[PDB]
C-alpha cells in the first residue's frame, strides 16, 4: 500500500526516537530515505546489545542499476518488499531478524 514500514521522510534522529518508543521491541524496524547519501534508503532496526540494552542500528540500502536493492551485494532484491520479506524470514547476517514495523 502505503507499506507500514515505509517512513520515507523520517530523519535518522527521529527514526531512533520512534523505534525506542513504547510498543516496539527487538526486530522492530523502518525503511527511510537516506540522510547522508541522497538517492539511497536506510534501514533502521531496534536491537538488543548484551551490555547496553535497547539500541537502534542503521544499514544502507543501495541501488543496483534500475530496479535492484541490496544491503550486501551477496543478495539483491527486485523491490524493497522482497528485501523486508527476506530478513524477516532469517537475519542472514543482519544484526537481528526483522519482526514488525515501527508502531506509531
Amino acid at each position: 500500500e502505503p507499506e507500514p514500514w515505509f517512513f520515507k521522510n523520517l530523519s535518522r534522529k527521529d527514526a531512533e526516537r520512534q523505534l525506542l518508543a513504547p510498543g516496539n521491541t527487538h526486530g522492530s524496524f523502518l525503511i527511510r530515505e537516506s540522510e547522508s547519501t541522497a538517492g539511497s534508503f536506510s534501514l533502521s532496526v531496534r536491537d538488543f546489545d548484551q551490555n547496553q540494552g535497547e539500541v537502534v542500528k542503521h544499514y544502507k540500502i543501495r541501488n543496483l542499476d534500475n530496479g535492484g536493492f541490496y544491503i550486501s551485494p551477496r543478495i539483491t532484491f527486485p523491490g524493497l518488499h522482497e528485501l523486508v520479506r527476506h530478513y524477516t524470514n532469517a537475519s542472514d547476517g543482519l544484526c537481528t531478524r526483522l519482526s514488525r514495523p515501527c508502531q506509531t
Binding site: 547522508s36 536506510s42 542503521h58 544499514y59 550486501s72 551477496r74 547476517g93 543482519l94 544484526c95
Partner: peptide, 11 residues
C-alpha cells in the same frame, strides 16, 4: 560521517 552497519563476510 554517521555510523552504518555492514553484513559481515564469513572468514
Amino acid at each position: 560521517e554517521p555510523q552504518y552497519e555492514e553484513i559481515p563476510i564469513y572468514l
